[PDB]
Every structure is written in C-alpha cells, then in structure tokens.
Design a protein around this motif. Structure first.
Motif, PDB file in Angstrom:
ATOM      1  N   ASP B  17      73.063   2.129  29.204  1.00 17.36           N
ATOM      2  CA  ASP B  17      72.117   2.838  30.040  1.00 17.36           C
ATOM      3  C   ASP B  17      72.735   2.872  31.431  1.00 17.36           C
ATOM      4  O   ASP B  17      72.580   1.922  32.204  1.00 17.36           O
ATOM      5  CB  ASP B  17      70.771   2.110  30.061  1.00 17.36           C
ATOM      6  CG  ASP B  17      69.726   2.831  30.915  1.00 17.36           C
ATOM      7  OD1 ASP B  17      68.832   2.128  31.461  1.00 17.36           O
ATOM      8  OD2 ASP B  17      69.804   4.085  31.034  1.00 17.36           O
ATOM      9  N   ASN B  20      71.640   0.822  34.497  1.00 15.61           N
ATOM     10  CA  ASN B  20      71.418  -0.604  34.341  1.00 15.61           C
ATOM     11  C   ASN B  20      72.583  -1.351  33.713  1.00 15.61           C
ATOM     12  O   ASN B  20      72.906  -1.175  32.534  1.00 15.61           O
ATOM     13  CB  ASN B  20      70.131  -0.924  33.592  1.00 15.61           C
ATOM     14  CG  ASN B  20      69.914  -2.405  33.463  1.00 15.61           C
ATOM     15  OD1 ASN B  20      70.253  -3.169  34.378  1.00 15.61           O
ATOM     16  ND2 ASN B  20      69.385  -2.839  32.322  1.00 15.61           N
ATOM     17  N   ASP B  22      72.652  -4.778  33.533  1.00 17.59           N
ATOM     18  CA  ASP B  22      72.127  -5.946  32.785  1.00 17.59           C
ATOM     19  C   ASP B  22      71.668  -5.491  31.397  1.00 17.59           C
ATOM     20  O   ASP B  22      70.488  -5.531  31.050  1.00 17.59           O
ATOM     21  CB  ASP B  22      71.008  -6.670  33.543  1.00 17.59           C
ATOM     22  CG  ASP B  22      70.614  -8.014  32.907  1.00 17.59           C
ATOM     23  OD1 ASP B  22      71.156  -8.421  31.847  1.00 17.59           O
ATOM     24  OD2 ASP B  22      69.739  -8.687  33.488  1.00 17.59           O
ATOM     25  N   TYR B  23      72.648  -5.089  30.600  1.00 14.74           N
ATOM     26  CA  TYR B  23      72.413  -4.383  29.357  1.00 14.74           C
ATOM     27  C   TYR B  23      73.155  -5.078  28.220  1.00 14.74           C
ATOM     28  O   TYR B  23      74.335  -5.415  28.374  1.00 14.74           O
ATOM     29  CB  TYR B  23      72.903  -2.941  29.503  1.00 14.74           C
ATOM     30  CG  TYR B  23      72.379  -2.068  28.419  1.00 14.74           C
ATOM     31  CD1 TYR B  23      71.164  -1.396  28.571  1.00 14.74           C
ATOM     32  CD2 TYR B  23      73.070  -1.934  27.215  1.00 14.74           C
ATOM     33  CE1 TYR B  23      70.660  -0.597  27.560  1.00 14.74           C
ATOM     34  CE2 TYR B  23      72.566  -1.135  26.194  1.00 14.74           C
ATOM     35  CZ  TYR B  23      71.368  -0.479  26.381  1.00 14.74           C
ATOM     36  OH  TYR B  23      70.879   0.291  25.385  1.00 14.74           O
ATOM     37  N   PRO B  24      72.472  -5.295  27.078  1.00 15.53           N
ATOM     38  CA  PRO B  24      73.062  -5.912  25.887  1.00 15.53           C
ATOM     39  C   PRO B  24      73.860  -4.922  25.019  1.00 15.53           C
ATOM     40  O   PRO B  24      73.466  -4.619  23.891  1.00 15.53           O
ATOM     41  CB  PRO B  24      71.840  -6.396  25.123  1.00 15.53           C
ATOM     42  CG  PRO B  24      70.761  -5.436  25.498  1.00 15.53           C
ATOM     43  CD  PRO B  24      71.055  -4.950  26.876  1.00 15.53           C
ATOM     44  N   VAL B  55      70.666  -3.261  16.690  1.00 12.82           N
ATOM     45  CA  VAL B  55      69.398  -3.889  16.324  1.00 12.82           C
ATOM     46  C   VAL B  55      68.530  -4.158  17.539  1.00 12.82           C
ATOM     47  O   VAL B  55      67.313  -4.160  17.420  1.00 12.82           O
ATOM     48  CB  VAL B  55      69.533  -5.165  15.392  1.00 12.82           C
ATOM     49  CG1 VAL B  55      70.802  -5.130  14.561  1.00 12.82           C
ATOM     50  CG2 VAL B  55      69.429  -6.466  16.169  1.00 12.82           C
ATOM     51  N   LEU B  56      69.138  -4.342  18.707  1.00 11.84           N
ATOM     52  CA  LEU B  56      68.364  -4.525  19.944  1.00 11.84           C
ATOM     53  C   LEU B  56      67.820  -3.217  20.482  1.00 11.84           C
ATOM     54  O   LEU B  56      66.621  -3.108  20.772  1.00 11.84           O
ATOM     55  CB  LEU B  56      69.183  -5.237  21.031  1.00 11.84           C
ATOM     56  CG  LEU B  56      69.907  -6.546  20.672  1.00 11.84           C
ATOM     57  CD1 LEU B  56      70.391  -7.188  21.959  1.00 11.84           C
ATOM     58  CD2 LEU B  56      69.055  -7.541  19.877  1.00 11.84           C
ATOM     59  N   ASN B  57      68.705  -2.233  20.628  1.00  7.08           N
ATOM     60  CA  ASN B  57      68.336  -0.930  21.148  1.00  7.08           C
ATOM     61  C   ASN B  57      68.642   0.197  20.154  1.00  7.08           C
ATOM     62  O   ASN B  57      69.731   0.795  20.162  1.00  7.08           O
ATOM     63  CB  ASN B  57      68.963  -0.694  22.520  1.00  7.08           C
ATOM     64  CG  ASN B  57      68.342  -1.575  23.607  1.00  7.08           C
ATOM     65  OD1 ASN B  57      68.967  -2.530  24.060  1.00  7.08           O
ATOM     66  ND2 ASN B  57      67.104  -1.264  24.021  1.00  7.08           N
ATOM     67  N   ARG B  58      67.652   0.490  19.310  1.00  4.22           N
ATOM     68  CA  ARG B  58      67.842   1.391  18.182  1.00  4.22           C
ATOM     69  C   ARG B  58      67.906   2.869  18.540  1.00  4.22           C
ATOM     70  O   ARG B  58      68.491   3.665  17.803  1.00  4.22           O
ATOM     71  CB  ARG B  58      66.825   1.101  17.075  1.00  4.22           C
ATOM     72  CG  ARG B  58      67.090  -0.254  16.432  1.00  4.22           C
ATOM     73  CD  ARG B  58      66.275  -0.524  15.182  1.00  4.22           C
ATOM     74  NE  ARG B  58      66.582   0.428  14.107  1.00  4.22           N
ATOM     75  CZ  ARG B  58      65.982   0.444  12.913  1.00  4.22           C
ATOM     76  NH1 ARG B  58      65.043  -0.454  12.626  1.00  4.22           N
ATOM     77  NH2 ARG B  58      66.331   1.353  12.003  1.00  4.22           N
ATOM     78  N   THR B  59      67.333   3.226  19.679  1.00  7.45           N
ATOM     79  CA  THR B  59      67.339   4.597  20.165  1.00  7.45           C
ATOM     80  C   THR B  59      68.327   4.748  21.317  1.00  7.45           C
ATOM     81  O   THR B  59      68.125   4.158  22.378  1.00  7.45           O
ATOM     82  CB  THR B  59      65.937   4.986  20.683  1.00  7.45           C
ATOM     83  OG1 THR B  59      64.989   4.751  19.651  1.00  7.45           O
ATOM     84  CG2 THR B  59      65.872   6.436  21.088  1.00  7.45           C
ATOM     85  N   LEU B  60      69.380   5.534  21.120  1.00 11.07           N
ATOM     86  CA  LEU B  60      70.339   5.785  22.189  1.00 11.07           C
ATOM     87  C   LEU B  60      69.645   6.447  23.359  1.00 11.07           C
ATOM     88  O   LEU B  60      68.942   7.435  23.177  1.00 11.07           O
ATOM     89  CB  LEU B  60      71.505   6.665  21.708  1.00 11.07           C
ATOM     90  CG  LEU B  60      72.415   6.129  20.596  1.00 11.07           C
ATOM     91  CD1 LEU B  60      73.625   7.044  20.351  1.00 11.07           C
ATOM     92  CD2 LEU B  60      72.877   4.723  20.925  1.00 11.07           C
ATOM     93  N   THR B  61      69.825   5.910  24.561  1.00  6.62           N
ATOM     94  CA  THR B  61      69.343   6.612  25.744  1.00  6.62           C
ATOM     95  C   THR B  61      70.029   7.969  25.787  1.00  6.62           C
ATOM     96  O   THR B  61      71.112   8.153  25.202  1.00  6.62           O
ATOM     97  CB  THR B  61      69.634   5.864  27.049  1.00  6.62           C
ATOM     98  OG1 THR B  61      71.042   5.905  27.342  1.00  6.62           O
ATOM     99  CG2 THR B  61      69.137   4.417  26.977  1.00  6.62           C
ATOM    100  N   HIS B 286      69.128 -10.738  31.671  1.00  5.61           N
ATOM    101  CA  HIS B 286      68.615 -10.248  30.411  1.00  5.61           C
ATOM    102  C   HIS B 286      69.666 -10.338  29.289  1.00  5.61           C
ATOM    103  O   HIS B 286      69.359 -10.851  28.206  1.00  5.61           O
ATOM    104  CB  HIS B 286      68.039  -8.837  30.583  1.00  5.61           C
ATOM    105  CG  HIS B 286      67.782  -8.121  29.295  1.00  5.61           C
ATOM    106  ND1 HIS B 286      66.867  -8.565  28.367  1.00  5.61           N
ATOM    107  CD2 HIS B 286      68.333  -6.999  28.775  1.00  5.61           C
ATOM    108  CE1 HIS B 286      66.860  -7.742  27.333  1.00  5.61           C
ATOM    109  NE2 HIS B 286      67.744  -6.786  27.555  1.00  5.61           N
ATOM    110  N   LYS B 289      70.032 -13.830  28.055  1.00  3.95           N
ATOM    111  CA  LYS B 289      68.836 -14.224  27.298  1.00  3.95           C
ATOM    112  C   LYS B 289      68.702 -13.662  25.880  1.00  3.95           C
ATOM    113  O   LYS B 289      68.522 -14.449  24.956  1.00  3.95           O
ATOM    114  CB  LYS B 289      67.532 -14.028  28.089  1.00  3.95           C
ATOM    115  CG  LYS B 289      66.880 -15.383  28.453  1.00  3.95           C
ATOM    116  CD  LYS B 289      65.369 -15.273  28.652  1.00  3.95           C
ATOM    117  CE  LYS B 289      64.570 -15.450  27.325  1.00  3.95           C
ATOM    118  NZ  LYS B 289      63.085 -15.567  27.568  1.00  3.95           N
TER     119      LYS B 289
END
Ligand code: ER3
Ligand code: ER3
Ligand code: ZN
Ligand code: ZN
Lengths: 296, 294
Positions: B17, B20, B22-24, B55-61, B286, B289
């Motif tokens: 993203d 941001n 602070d992105y996994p 699995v964390l962010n399933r929808t691509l921005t 984030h 975490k």
C-alpha cells in the motif's frame, strides 16, 4: 402522543475496511457503535452504549486512505476481537439491558449499515441475519419526507448526517466517520425530528425478493470505480433486498416475519431466492467480493 | 572465475500500500529464471512463475494492482505461499543441481533480506541456506561503474539504470516478476561478458554490532521507504553483511559469517531482539505484531 411505537431506539453505526478507489472490496466491520434513545421519556442515553473495535480476517491491514477516512488507527484493530466475538458480546449486551425483541428498533443514517454491511459481514462470519437487523429506521428517508412536509431549503453538505444537521441547523458533534460521533449526531437529529412532530418508525425491511431483480442487471464494465454502480451489484449479490413500508402500514407484529414470503425469519433468508447467475458466468471478469464471501 | 555452474534469477512481487510503509508485505508472484554459466546461456525454458494468494491482505489495494499489474482474479485462484514454496522446492530437485553450486541473483537486497525473510516468518518456514547467500546484481553494477567509468543516468529503478548503462532495451513491463527476471538475466549476461567479477556478495547473518545500540526513532517513519528500512533491519533476525568480490568461497554454504555455526543452529532465534522498539504500545509496529515478533 408518541408516534414511535418502540420504547427504545438504538442508533447504530458501523465502520468498515475500505479502499477508496475500489468498490470491488469485501468490507469487514472494524467498528461497532450503538447509543440508546428512550422513546417515552424523550432521552438520549449516552450511558447505554456499545462501542467496540473489530479485527478483520480478510484485510487485516487498514488501507491508509481508510484510516484517513475513518480516523481509526491500526493499533486499535490489532488489539480488537474478531467479528463473531464482538457480535456475541453485542448479543450479550442486549440481554443484560433487558430489551424485548420487537420493542426496540435500530436507527441508521442510510440503508448501508444493515442492508449492505451487516448482511455481508454476517455472510463472512457465517451468522444468520437476525430479525432486528431485518427491519429498521432509515433516518435519512424520514428526513427527506420531513423536508417535503416543512419546506425544502438549500443544502451544501454532502453526507446524510451533514445535511440533516445543516437543515435543522444543529452543530456538528465530534468528527465525521468516527462511529460513536456518528451515533451521537444521529441521536441528536432524531431527537430534534421527534420534537418537530416527525413519525419515527421502521420504514425499511429486508426481504427475500424483489420484482425488479427479475430483470437482469444491465452491466457497467467500469462499476468498480463508482459507488452507485457497485451498489447495484451488491443489490443482486446479497440475498436480502430493501423493501420500503409506509408509516401507517407498519405493525410491531411484523417483527421476525418476512414482508414478501410471510415466513418466519429463521427460515426465510437461508438461501438466495434470486441468485444472479447472469453475473456469475463471465469467468474472465469475476466479482471479487462475491467470490471471497462464497456466493459463487 | 564465477564459481557457479548455474545462476537462478529470482524476483518477488508483494502486496503493498504505497503510502503506508508499516505493511506486512506478502508474496503474490514468485519468479525464477535459470542461467547456464559455462554456456553463457539464459535459459527461458527452465523457469518458475507462480502467483501467490496472501492470508493477511486478501484484496490487493488498487495502487498495488496499478504498480505490479497483477489483477485480483490471478491471486484469488492461487495457492498460499506454503504451497507455492513446496512447489518451488519440488521444482529445484527437478533441475538436478549440486548443493552449493547454484546461487540466486536479485536486483537488490529487498527480495531475500526483507521479502523472503518476512514471508517465511508468516508461513513459519525456515529460512533456507540458499537464501542466506546471494548475488546483489546492483552492488556489482555499482562497482562496474568505477572500473569502466560513470555515466549520468536519468533512469529511475535498479533494473532501469542497469539497462540504461549497458544500453539494453527494456524487456516486457516493469514489476512483472518474470519480466523483471528476464531483464536481470540479460543484464547479468552483458555484465559477465564485459568483465565483471560475478559471485556471492551478500550474506545473511544473525548478528551485527550496529544493532547493539537502539535505533534513533523517527515518529514519521511510516511514510518513508528509507526510514522503514531501518526498522525492518532491527525487527528481522538476519541482517545483510557484505563480502568483497574475491573473498567468497563455495564452502561457505551454509555457515553463518558472524558466528561461524551451521545455519540450522544459527537462525532459530533473533540474537538481537529490539526490545527498545517494542515498548511504546501507543505507537506499535504493525508488521512486527502480525508476524509475531512481539
Ligand atoms: Er458512519
Ligand atoms: Er521486482
Ligand atoms: Zn422472505
Ligand atoms: Zn550466526
């Protein structure tokens, strides 16, 4: 001299995950906020409230444009419970308050919170849509009738809350899109509306069927960049559909009974009565939010 | 001279993203192209190209879709990293390569130091020895500009600059993993042919004394790639150490440069856990975490 047949109205508001430029998005609740209003005593009860952050499971990291829009920071969602857990707490909260189903109703500022957001989230979480989410008061629609009745006037605000506040000439409380602040604005507007003689009762119902879903959707190829056209897609994807009702025709005993099929709401709703097969066959241009929720 | 019989050009694309940091980051495309060293042959028919489902962010921005070119459907029909990774592992054995006689090649330190390392924490896969030594093509390139002499370059990315220098045409589109891979192999080829020392120049190590002292915290780091780099450096257990051109030796596979131990021993715990960063739970990190670093 109470037009409102409920003893208590619950002002409800959800905030969701989002990605501004993309409407093909599986919104997950990230904030669950409710404030009570005492109908007989005409009192906003700011001490009877529910306010929880929710942790998403599909898109765990808040889009930057989502945190700017909602004001919700990533830390508050990383410590939050998932929806199934926050939903069960809510259920527990209703109980401790001793609210008799059918004698309270939810008040929202548009159809979005219950028709789209509750429904979809509830599909994601595999929870049956409860009867109290299947009838509600769209305060914006009562507002528009109240304008016709009292006299239209020029409005520059762009949100439903903003317009209502502008028209009744009320001062904005808190910031826009902070769920609890949205609740207090709505509660206040609602209280003003009542004092001005409005009849505040359920006006929207969720129903298995609509005859305008019989005609297939005329597809817009660019629907993903438009909130309106995405709404039309949601309308065909989601089992339940919004049916309106006139104030005089509403009865408390309709609670839990589907306006269209007349069945109990433990039966109606369990499967889509108008599955939009016409939209589910172009394998090349799939609808992401329908796929990920398992509608096909 | 270059001591490897075969070089593997690896590239990852990730969820992101833009605004941001602070992105996994999660792998969404995993591409590799083989290069035959003795025959000087870019082998496009020996390759690995897969999409990966997050699995964390399933929808691509949207901005991730714009940048990478990858559409949502290609990720919705894909397997998760753990499955794709076992596929990759299976594919390796297919190639019949001799242990420590192949090395990976990347356009920067990102793919393996940051992306692989992090993704593999998410997926709970042990960081493989063959990801703890690799060739950073850009560092070698940097050095080739000293030897052969500078040019003013207007190009914008590592692959861009290298193509501009060696006066090579852009292959395919940027940030398609396979397209990135082909450009890298092509560049790699010209570099070798113009006299470059090509070897392992970067190693992944448990320990570096510059993590002994807490980081000078910058409250506005989440909007800067450089500054987020600094915190990634503290969060991830393994750190990048540099090795000069002539100094690498085949039998360094896979012993850790810092502590000299085998890379099944060294590797399990973080030897420099940045406790000082994990103390302000009103400004948490984030990415650390969700990954379970704390
Ligand atoms: Er709202
Ligand atoms: Er790349
Ligand atoms: Zn029905
Ligand atoms: Zn070590």
């Amino acid at each position: 001299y109470q037009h409102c047949p409920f003893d208590t109205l619950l002002i409800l508001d959800f905030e969701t995950t989002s990605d501004a430029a993309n409407q093909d998005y599986p919104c997950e609740v990230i904030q669950f906020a409710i404030v009570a209003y005492d109908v007989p005593n005409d009192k906003i009860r700011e001490d009877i409230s529910f306010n929880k952050y929710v942790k998403p499971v599909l898109n765990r990291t808040l889009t930057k444009n989502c945190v700017d829009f909602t004001g919700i920071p990533q830390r508050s969602i990383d410590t939050a419970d998932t929806f199934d857990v926050v939903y069960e707490q809510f259920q527990q909260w209703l109980i401790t308050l001793g609210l008799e189903e059918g004698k309270f109703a939810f008040v929202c500022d548009s159809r979005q919170d219950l028709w789209r957001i509750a429904q979809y989230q509830m599909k994601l979480s595999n929870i049956q849509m409860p009867a109290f989410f299947r009838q509600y008061i769209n305060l914006y629609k009562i507002f528009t009738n109240e304008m016709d009745r009292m006299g239209p006037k020029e409005l520059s605000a762009t949100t439903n809350i903003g317009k209502m506040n502008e028209y009744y000439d009320l001062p904005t409380i808190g910031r826009a899109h902070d769920a609890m602040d949205d609740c207090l604005n709505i509660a206040t507007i609602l209280q003003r509306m009542i004092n001005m003689g409005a009849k505040v009762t359920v006006n929207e119902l969720l129903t298995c069927c609509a005859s305008w879903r019989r005609q297939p959707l005329v597809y817009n190829k660019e629907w993903r960049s438009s909130f309106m056209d995405a709404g039309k897609i949601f309308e065909r994807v989601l089992p339940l559909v919004v049916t309106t009702i006139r104030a005089g025709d509403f009865r408390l005993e309709m609670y839990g009974v589907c306006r269209y099929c007349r069945k109990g709401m433990d039966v109606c709703g369990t499967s889509h009565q108008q599955t939009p097969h016409d939209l589910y066959k172009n394998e090349e241009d799939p609808i992401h939010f329908a796929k990920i929720a398992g509608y096909y």
